[PDB]
Design a protein around this nucleic acid. Sequence first.
DNA 1: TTAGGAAAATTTGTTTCATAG
DNA 2: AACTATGAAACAAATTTTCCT
Lengths: 80, 80
Amino acid sequence: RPPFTYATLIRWAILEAPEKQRTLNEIYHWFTRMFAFFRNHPATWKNAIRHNLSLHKCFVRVESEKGAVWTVDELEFRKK
Amino acid sequence: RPPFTYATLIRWAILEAPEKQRTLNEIYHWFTRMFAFFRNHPATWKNAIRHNLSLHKCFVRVESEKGAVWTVDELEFRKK
DNA sequence: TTAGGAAAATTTGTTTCATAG
DNA sequence: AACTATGAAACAAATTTTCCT
């Protein structure tokens, strides 16, 4: 359960730039976009994840390793 | 300013794990570690984020003919 | 084994908000 | 100042399938 540090979230947001760079302000915007989701989560969100996982083609269940897992299809994602 | 969608976040959670794949309940946790973080620090966020970029030296400022921007030095996270 | 129930997946159904005509 | 048509997204929920005792 390693929790989330500023350090990390910043890495994650910089790394979601088209170019692996972002302006302080864009970073706010990233944080803001995310603040703007976690309070406006529902009681059932586990329902919403199960749902999106089945529904979109970008998520594909494979069976390997410890148990059955979920993986992304970067291609299918790129079109949405 | 919009939320990110389930789909985006979910994609992310899948990716955090370096193996680019994770079970359902491994995702529920990523989501929690977020849920948590934002319940905790919804303070003067912005301010933190210049304090870190500067402090943690895995964050580096570079010049674009765009403008002055931040990148991560991935070779300077993990450890040294 | 084999149940039996619960967690995962999957499927349908409602409703909203945002776009081009 | 509709009205038409389209589609993402979120949410609820209803069934079926896998997985864990």
